[PDB]
Amino acid sequence: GGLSQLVAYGAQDVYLTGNPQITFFKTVYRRYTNFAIESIQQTINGSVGFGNKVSTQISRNGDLITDIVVEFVLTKGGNGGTTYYPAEELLQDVELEIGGQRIDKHYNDWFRTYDALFRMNDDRYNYRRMTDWVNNELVGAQKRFYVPLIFFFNQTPGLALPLIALQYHEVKLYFTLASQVQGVNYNGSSAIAGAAQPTMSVWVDYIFLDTQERTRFAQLPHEYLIEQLQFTGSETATPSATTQASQNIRLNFNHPTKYLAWNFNNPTNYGQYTALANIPGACSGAGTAAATVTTPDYGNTGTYNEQLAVLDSAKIQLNGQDRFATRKGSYFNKVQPYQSIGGVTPAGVYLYSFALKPAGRQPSGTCNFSRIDNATLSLTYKTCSIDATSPAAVLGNTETVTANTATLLTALNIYAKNYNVLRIMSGMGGLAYA
Template sequence: MGGGLMQLVAYGAQDIYLTGNPQITFFKVVYRRHTNFSMETIRQTLNGTSTSVITGNATCTISRNGDLVHKVYVVADSSTANNGSALVYEVELEIGGQRIDRHYQEWNEVWNELSTDESKALALKSMQCEVGTGGSGAVETVQIPLNFWFCRNPGLALPLIALQYHEVKIKFTWGNAGASLNPEVWCDYIYLDTDERRRFAQVSHEYLIEQLQKETYTSTAGDKKLNFNHPVKELVWVNDTGGAEGVKYQLKLNGHDRFAEQTKEYFMLRQPFDHHTAVPKQNLPVSAQIGLSNNTISNLTALSDGAEMTPKDAAGASSNEITVAGGTALKVETAVFDDISVGDTLVLVISALDASNDAFLPTASRAVGDVFFAGVSAKSGTQDITLSTKFTKLGSANTQLDTIDVGTGGQGRCFLHKVSNTSQSEARTSKLSKEINVYSFALKPEEHQPSGTCNFSRIDNAQLKVTGSDGGGRIYAVNYNVLRIMSGMGGLAYSN
């Protein structure tokens, strides 16, 4: 009997819980037929400021070209824009003159960072002209997706066919994208077949939608009041300057602790890891090897060559030697100095040896490929670097360097790398460089299906306790509400 058949007949009482009375098979595909529809992208008319400038405003009345409206993009042609996501500083949705939702540049950057899969992160950043711009790449069109509820889920597409008596308007406040742009608005329309179109036009609709609320808080420690309403599924707060080490947060509801006080890493790393598609890149401390000049690697050169990296002046140093004064002091070019941070590790790699002019002294245990390292403990002036220890050979703590000898014109004998353990400077999907903190009441806050909320309308006193200074910033709350559409008009079921 073959092994496959042996597995098949090895069937016991426990297997009844797995395969007894089967309801599906993996070997016969099942599908469901859908209603007939089509889609088309159509440009909208903008009224107001047509060029993006600070405080410039424009209004777009969604035309009735199709039955439903789904995705909305802001588009602008430019080869010089370098921060496209800043084009939409603020955007507001109105139905029948009532504001339904309002989003901000910062929130769009935060949401994209949390919800964009890694496979699409660089593409989104490219679409917003934040990489490969200035004529150096092929991306010359800014394309910014809006993140209203109907833009993210086709099942929530806004039924224009049922809003015969109410106009849908999108109001923009333009920002500075690094260039003067002429923005356009493009909408994806959905066309329904006759029967479904008739049903959408005649019956009333109730949509469970998502809204955004915002509070600004100061940098001082203490309790920050949260004036939010409606069932909230998650809180997200953004620091302006980044919190200091040891900052802690705690949520209080009507004087009761919602959870034990936690360090900021719980909200920056653990919560996004548990509840979102991605952990924000700028929250992650990473080890990154990068060069100290415009090239990937900086060469060490002799004093007489105007070295990219030279030591402090030391008595008795010849033109063929680079002496590290006391073994822990270096002097570097200003351009290199700016690339080095306290806490970084400098790594020296021997790339060549010369019998008459060895690359390193002392001569013990030296060989091509040997690696020596030292930490950076302090910086001063514009060139002076203090090392925490002498350059020490990897794997041999007893072998340390006092003198580096690369010979006259010795370019290429030794290479210098930097290994840093600091946070990324900007996000995966934008140029946002602020810490993102998350606390989710929902199991899966990115999904439309509710999986947990806290009804802030029933909370008299909600506070976020901050221990330590985190730079201040803004707190966002994502809440549910109900949009009712009947008799050709639409409005919210619950107000603030």
């Protein structure tokens, strides 16, 4: 029985159980402060509608804030398969400002990129359920969507923003709503007659602190090591059926960077990071007579089909020196996520981490671009000679080629997630570094 194993003891056990330090059969729980959480609706100023800019000022109902969820009500302008994360698309961007200072700013594409790299398993599925229609809903269906924000204070209570310690500074969220959302008010370039304007509401989760903790937050200075997103849009050295396009992109980045992330995309179709093709999930009508490689199956815009991705290879140069040996696009798409995050990244989305664990909150190695005169991302594209309308050509091809619909992925989005210091003192706050 179990005793027959305990008796099997000797020298090789000393390293494991001699002079024991711990047990596994008794947990010490740590007494904590007294607090409560409440979801409080914010007032949104400005007219809500497609393409409009609206904003909200966070109220002082509680002492600290964490989670923020933006609610939207959208309706279907067509049947299942016509939308793709439409609430994520709708929230074109969100800017976080404290005391008039920009702390951070996210874009719909960032939310898509972030999700592609950092969410997973049922978290990812539940996420999709909060931003899209995933049960084959039909035209006219109404749904409330919830878009969680991903600012540093929205990911951990550990970085809760001490609004209580910001007595003289207002905190605002500026939101841009997309001019168009696929399958909601537009179908490709065509407007959808009768489309409703979205209903919007912003909820902020407030932490109510008891007397001793509340007093300390209100009076003491604070420093937080927080995350920021750096982002610029670039034009892609568009692939050609005749050759391997190449490009050297100066990266206007600064600060200790945890990771870079990027994608190539068709700016017309939100979330399209791959070339279209006549294979079952790669285009509108794929597999039948009506198939076209000019329009995606929006409900299946994202894919793991690497052959439709357009990056052959890439490397990052620092001041002219390769930071690492050139690796294939597939490294950045499949391996980096394996090595550092543990989820699965869809084709067309790439990651390169400078951190051991980029998905966490503890710094684990950074590349400080504020000390790098010239940071450049070098890209080599695949030859776009594959006839996208022919599965034999799409599915039986080689490593270095892609579909001719790859020429549509003309946009390149390069992101860098970095660490800065948020300092709150004597009722004011903002960041230490520019």
